[PDB]
């Protein structure tokens, strides 16, 4: 497992749930077994998580309305059956509609919350509509002082683990007193909760050196 896959919850990484480290060691033999994805500014996400030094995850119910939750795929197989990143919730249509999605998560706690979310890029327009109804999806994740709007883009990408489609991963940090707001007319890969952020001596290293006592 790479640190990011452990973060996201790729099934073969599920051992790493809620783990802690001073030093996370990434091996060269690591590989991704789940829905093919990418992280814009991968380096930064990797850094800030490595530095936080904990994967501790705290669940939160978001009030989603009139959409199916827990979408999954055969590209990401958990056990015998189809699956998906454990920390992400794939939302899609209920029947003939994907109601615009507008939700809030205040941070009333003592520390910072790290939210990992995503946008789905379908391969064909058919795939877009079969999932989200509307031909053009969109996701805006915001706080009081900052915002991100991602527009998903339909098109083909190299075949990977079965799919020509992709997921783009994004993150939002919410300080205490701030509020998270998620707004989507579809294509949203929703967070299931937050990762606790810590400061300290933690970091990450790439090495093939055996660990020893």
């Amino acid at each position, epitope marked *: 497992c790479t640190l990011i896959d452990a973060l996201l919850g790729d099934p073969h990484c599920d051992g790493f749930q809620n783990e802690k480290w001073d030093l996370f060691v990434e091996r060269s033999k690591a590989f991704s077994n789940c829905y093919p994805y990418d992280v814009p500014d991968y380096a930064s996400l990797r850094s800030l998580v490595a530095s936080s030094g904990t994967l501790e995850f705290i669940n939160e119910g978001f009030n989603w309305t009139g959409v199916t939750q827990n979408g999954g795929s*055969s590209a990401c197989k958990r056990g015998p059956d189809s699956g998906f990143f454990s920390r992400l919730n794939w939302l899609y*249509k*209920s029947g*003939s509609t994907y109601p615009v999605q507008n939700v809030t998560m205040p941070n009333n706690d003592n520390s910072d919350k790290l939210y990992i979310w995503g946008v789905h890029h379908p*391969s064909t327009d*058919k*795939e877009q509509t*079969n999932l989200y109804v509307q031909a053009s999806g969109k996701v805006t994740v915001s706080t009081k002082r900052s915002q991100q709007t991602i527009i998903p883009n339909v098109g083909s990408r190299p075949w990977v683990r079965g799919l020509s489609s992709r997921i783009s991963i994004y993150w939002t940090i919410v300080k205490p007193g701030d509020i998270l707001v998620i707004n989507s007319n579809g294509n949203l890969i929703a967070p299931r909760g937050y990762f606790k952020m810590r400061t300290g001596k933690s970091s990450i290293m790439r090495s093939d050196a055996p660990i020893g006592t």
Partner: antibody, heavy 118, light 108 residues
Framework: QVQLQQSGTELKKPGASVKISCKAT????????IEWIKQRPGHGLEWIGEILPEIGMTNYNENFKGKATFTANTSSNTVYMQLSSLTSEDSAVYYCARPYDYSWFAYWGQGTLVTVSA | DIVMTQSQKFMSTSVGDRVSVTCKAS??????VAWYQEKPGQSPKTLIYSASNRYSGVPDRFTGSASGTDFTLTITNVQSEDLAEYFCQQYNSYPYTFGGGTKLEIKR
């Protein structure tokens, strides 16, 4: 012309399992959900669930969770439904259907009869 | 779940006459409702969608209507080939639900 070809009739002892196939022809296979519907002689029409073939996303009726499992072979353009732990309650005619595009049903299969008894 | 109630298990009509099947959703489905015709021994066939709309190849005799949660399939000039069972479906939200079915019966 769009055609959904289901598999032959089936007879199965209680407690066994069965895999019914739906073979889609005459349209791009990956562009449409495949739906499964159950019909018992006194219960009318129950919706089992749907599967979107490319990405293998399965959506089940809460009532069938654990009874029914959809899969898709994208090379053979075929959708399979598997029924497990069969009881007499599962004796019915099973249809597979394709939406016009994303919602209401346009094309139906010819049906597969499944009978369960010792 | 949403219940689609077709209260008429059997309808009586005569050829050339007019007949209406009712279906009542138990909560708002908007206008997303379809009507299907199942003849004996054949597979279901599609009649109506969006509650008012004629699917291609369907005779002008069949017309759907909707008022609120009330949906009605009306056949004018019933023919003999119209002997069948009629199902309504709400495709509005999951799970998709169906009506009990209404068997059309003829008097000659």
């Amino acid at each position: 012309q769009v055609q959904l070809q289901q598999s032959g009739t089936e007879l199965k002892k209680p407690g066994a399992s069965v895999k019914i196939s739906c073979k889609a022809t005459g349209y791009t296979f990956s562009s449409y959900w495949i739906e499964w519907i159950k019909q018992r002689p006194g219960h009318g029409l129950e919706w089992i669930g749907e599967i979107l073939p490319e990405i293998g996303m399965t959506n089940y009726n809460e009532n069938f969770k654990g009874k029914a499992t959809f899969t898709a072979n994208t090379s053979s353009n075929t959708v399979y439904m598997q029924l497990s732990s069969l009881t007499s309650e599962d004796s019915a005619v099973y249809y597979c259907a394709r939406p016009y595009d994303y919602s209401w049903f346009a094309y139906w299969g010819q049906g597969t009869l499944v009978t369960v008894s010792a | 779940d949403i219940v689609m109630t077709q209260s008429q298990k059997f309808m009586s009509t005569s050829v050339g006459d007019r007949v209406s099947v009712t279906c009542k959703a138990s909560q708002n489905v908007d206008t997303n409702v379809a009507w299907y015709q199942e003849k004996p021994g054949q597979s279901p066939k599609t009649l109506i969608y969006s509650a008012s709309n004629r699917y291609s190849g369907v005779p002008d005799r069949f017309t759907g209507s909707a008022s609120g949660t009330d949906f009605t399939l009306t056949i004018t000039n019933v023919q003999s080939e119209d002997l069948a069972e009629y199902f309504c479906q709400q495709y509005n939200s999951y799970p998709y639900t169906f009506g009990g079915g209404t068997k059309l019966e003829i008097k000659r």
